[PDB]
Ligand binder design. Structure first.
Ligand SMILES: C[C@H](N)c1cn(-c2ccccc2)nn1
Ligand SMILES: C[C@H](N)c1cn(-c2ccccc2)nn1
Lengths: 39, 156
């Protein structure tokens, strides 16, 4: 029996922690909604 | 139940203790999450019940109480923020420049941020605070790290 609990407002935060790269990937999406890498 | 707009954890008491299986967005009286978080099951908000209204396994999305309301799109140029809601941890904004998933049917933004599976459903926002999609459906790349699509629905 799943239930929900509020965790916050949806807002943009100025000076938030900045991380992560920006990869460009070739991918395929199957009928089950799974992504896979194409090579 | 609580119907105020915002980000919410999706919990279950079926497993050991109370386990967070994902996250979602309440907007205009509709709750939005990824299909793999709930599997389309009904949800509780206090004493209230939220019933599924629309869903699609291939898009990996589901809406409750009404049709999908989120329609903002990544501009393809700017940094966005993941509003990560990890299990047992405070909501925290993470800013990043998305990469891209290139597919036979077009391209979509992707974020290269690695969080526990129970973070799935967390919203990705633009500079105006609009939700441009949900985090949690993606791929595992060469070094074992994770890259999520920016998954957005269609507003009918
Ligand atoms: C190995 C897996 N991709 C993972 C989980 N976590 C983590 C990050 C934030 C909060 C809690 C846990 N960091 N790596
Ligand atoms: C083009 C549109 N902005 C879009 C498509 N999708 C999508 C992602 C994964 C699976 C299915 C659909 N997310 N946004």
């Amino acid at each position: 029996d799943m239930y929900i609990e509020r965790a916050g407002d949806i807002t943009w935060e100025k000076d938030a922690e900045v991380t992560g790269n920006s990869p460009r990937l070739d991918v395929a999406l199957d009928e089950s909604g799974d992504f896979s890498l194409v090579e | 139940g609580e119907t105020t707009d915002g980000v919410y954890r999706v919990m279950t008491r079926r497993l050991l203790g109370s386990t967070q299986v994902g996250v979602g967005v309440m907007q205009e009286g509709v709750f939005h999450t990824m299909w793999h978080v709930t599997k389309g099951a009904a949800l509780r908000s206090g004493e209230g019940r939220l019933d599924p209204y629309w869903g699609d396994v291939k898009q990996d999305l589901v809406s409750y109480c009404g049709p999908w309301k989120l329609d903002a799109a990544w501009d393809g140029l700017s940094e966005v923020q993941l509003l990560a809601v990890p299990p047992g941890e405070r909501a925290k904004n993470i800013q990043t420049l998305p990469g891209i998933f290139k597919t036979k049917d077009g391209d979509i933004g992707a974020v290269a941020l690695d969080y526990p599976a129970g973070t799935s459903g967390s919203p990705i926002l633009d500079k105006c605070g609009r939700v441009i999609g949900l985090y949690g459906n993606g791929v595992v790349i060469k070094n074992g790290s994770y890259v999520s699509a920016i998954t957005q629905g269609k507003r009918e």
